[PDB]
Symmetry: D3
Subunit: 173 residues, 6 copies
Amino acid sequence: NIDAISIGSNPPEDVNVIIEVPVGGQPIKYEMDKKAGALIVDRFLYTPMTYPGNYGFVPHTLSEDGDPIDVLVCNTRPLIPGCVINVRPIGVLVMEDNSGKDEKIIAVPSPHLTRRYEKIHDYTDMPEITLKQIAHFFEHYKDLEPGKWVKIGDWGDEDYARKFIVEAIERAK
Amino acid sequence: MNIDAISIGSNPPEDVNVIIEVPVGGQPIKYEMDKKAGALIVDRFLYTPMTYPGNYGFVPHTLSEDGDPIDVLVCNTRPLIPGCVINVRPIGVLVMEDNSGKDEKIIAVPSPHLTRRYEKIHDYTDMPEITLKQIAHFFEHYKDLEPGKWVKIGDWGDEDYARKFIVEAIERAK
Amino acid sequence: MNIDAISIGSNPPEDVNVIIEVPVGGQPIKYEMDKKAGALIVDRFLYTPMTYPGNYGFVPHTLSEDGDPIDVLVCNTRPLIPGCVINVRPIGVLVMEDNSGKDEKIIAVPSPHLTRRYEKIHDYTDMPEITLKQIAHFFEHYKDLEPGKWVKIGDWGDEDYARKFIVEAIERAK
Amino acid sequence: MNIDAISIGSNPPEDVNVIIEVPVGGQPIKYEMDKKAGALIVDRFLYTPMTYPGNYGFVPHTLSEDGDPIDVLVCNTRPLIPGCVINVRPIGVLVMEDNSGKDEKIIAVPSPHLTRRYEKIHDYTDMPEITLKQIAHFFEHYKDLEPGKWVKIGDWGDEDYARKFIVEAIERAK
Amino acid sequence: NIDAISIGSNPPEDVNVIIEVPVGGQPIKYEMDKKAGALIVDRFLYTPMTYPGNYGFVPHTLSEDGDPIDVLVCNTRPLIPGCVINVRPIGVLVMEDNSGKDEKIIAVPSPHLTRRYEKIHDYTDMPEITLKQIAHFFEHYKDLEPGKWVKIGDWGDEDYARKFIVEAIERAK
Amino acid sequence: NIDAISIGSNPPEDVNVIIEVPVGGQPIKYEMDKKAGALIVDRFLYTPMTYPGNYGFVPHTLSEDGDPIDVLVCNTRPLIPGCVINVRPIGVLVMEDNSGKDEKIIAVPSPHLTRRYEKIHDYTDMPEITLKQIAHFFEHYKDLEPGKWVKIGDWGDEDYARKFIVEAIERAK
């Protein structure tokens, strides 16, 4: 029951992410179905790529496209699909594609879950390799889909991420 | 997961939704979904040195002659997440006989809105012969070390037989 | 999933149902079950270079003195799917002390209707001594990098203790 | 690697050295080492949905009647690194007939100085019955999808048969 | 001992490939040290990509750049690094990068190892998606390396593949 | 042919490590045999632990105990057993056990293989979690062997690492 999962303790300082796909996962897109509480296969992709972090959404949020906001958790160990992890947003991967703007929050596990990301506050605090892996996956994983293109824009910082999350919380209400 | 929120399909029997229990390449440990709890229950550990030849699950809101939802082997190549739902096109039926009588398993491919790979696969005979043999070989032999169990593979049912089988199982459930 | 639809077992404490959190071989992560949500909530990442020595999970509708469901290590060899349910036979209790007091974990094997492999195992002493040492070593050390967390392994509880422990937790939850 | 610098063993046939080709859990892709290059050559891809039931390799400086080094299935639980060398105790022989005549696989466990786990295992009958049945099942069935290939499992050889078999192959290679 | 591995039984109809990275493998580049008879790490790549077939090189061959020729074996199961597999060449992936022309042989397992590929003689016999996956990987896998670029050219057919291999065998003599 | 692999290009600042066990590897001890160029199984351990980095030895070195020096490469991707990787020593894990002093060099891959470790020169430059993971593995993985004990002493810095290597190079001559 996704209705019982809070947005967070003190959003947007922390948000809860319901995980859909693990880091290292195949480029098979899954979408959670609210009523069923089940992950639905949405599309198989054929690029030779793997998800560059754990990927999910924040419940009770709404993007302008009418979906909950997506979050790439940039840790290294795989998480179980359907689990919930509390995270600190640190930035936004800002893109444009065929259908317009596409923005993905970048987040690390919250500090009560691990010391590893204690001192990471903004996307620029992550290693440049990790940032580029994230951008590269989302830029290219749809390349073998006819006509689908992605342009990577200027990244949003930690303050932009907080604003974007609050906007989506408001938009859901 | 609430099973009642998952439909049989958009336009069954041309498509059905399969709730995945075990992935392709998975160990032969039989998992079975409980309908109320929405949880996969371990049903039986098997000990043959074998692996599932496709992603395996069942279609919700259907009933076999034996009182279980119908089973589907999804013959794509990549492992799927246990407990996910995938929409599929039925293409045939693996028909068998064992200790307790008839045992029939739908063979299906991912629907064409999920991937173009299986666009032109309509009948089980459209799949590579070896894939079909792999499927039969698994189901024929994975219970070989269960004392006193036996399985015989019968003639495969075609895509028309698969449609009729599904419609019958939908009625049986309703 | 809905945990109120998952029973404690058919004839507790001869058998109990364990909801699996982490498979044998899995890197250590701790979770809390959100009963309302029916989702596993990440609680802590551990960083010791250790792997669970069995499939690990908890028994719903039970309550420890510390206010959590009782934990079970299932000492079979193959990994199970996180979030599945397995019916098990309790055979003993790993009994420990740590910075928060007494900490007891049930040791269990799959029930005999799932596999014949453990059918003669009734007590923790029926297991290979090495398996018991592995289990103790894991729980003694896996929190070693957390500040102020220490663990001392005490005397194991037998199958009679394990059943009493379970019954006490079932009552405690009422 | 330089196979000439790898001895048959310390005191064969009580111990022999096995050069590992394929790990337990491995896909049924047959690898064969080339003596002069010291490299594993791919020999055949098999398509049964099966996995090797033990670590599998050969004893160097031995020769079967058919002109190959003798094969050994090391029946421990953990995968070993292909191309490594492990010292083992032979305990029996899986004896088969196929299209090209007799086919025999030595069964062995890790020698007692590598682990205490198999210290008391002297004959194949000392292993759990299921492990033996898994080993037979694999070799009986993994070639089932190869056109025209057949395999019959004959009576197992005991530990004294295995030793004699090894001694004969050591002598044949001189 | 690489001098005890032949080029093949009847090159260029078959050649032996020493495997470096398996299908599904995270990309690492090696140099083969002929005297040590060992793979030496040359470069860790960090793109979130995986080799689209089993990848290796043919001993006793020499490209114009003075490297053994590289082969991507387009089967589905992973092979052990350092093993040798006999393959049938079916085409050439032709590219341009920072260092000039760059060409990689595409091959399938030879028919005495498996019947699965026995009707595949030219790159056009492969599924078009497999060809696109292969191009995508070699186009993009160096994207996180500063300044590295790749342009994919026209594929070479099975006749071109055989000519290319024979030139490299002569070049090595 | 280990005698053809050099100690490094400019040792002790870099050294070549012949890999025996990969990171995440089971605690099964493998020991390379010089004359055969083969990894020999030496002991199966039963602690529920995994190697915290890639592990191997530097050829043409000799410890007081008569063995090549051991190196733990504290990267994250698994390496092939038997490959050679050039590394930068950054420190030493100093221990005492049943047989006396036991010292293991800690190293990162050299900067011409990757930019990820560019700025790491001393063990104190690594994250505390990584250091504690390495010490924990060596401290405990022999706990279930009869009589085997390990005490972790004070870590040696990058200079002590280089001195230790130079002593082992001189000792081999």
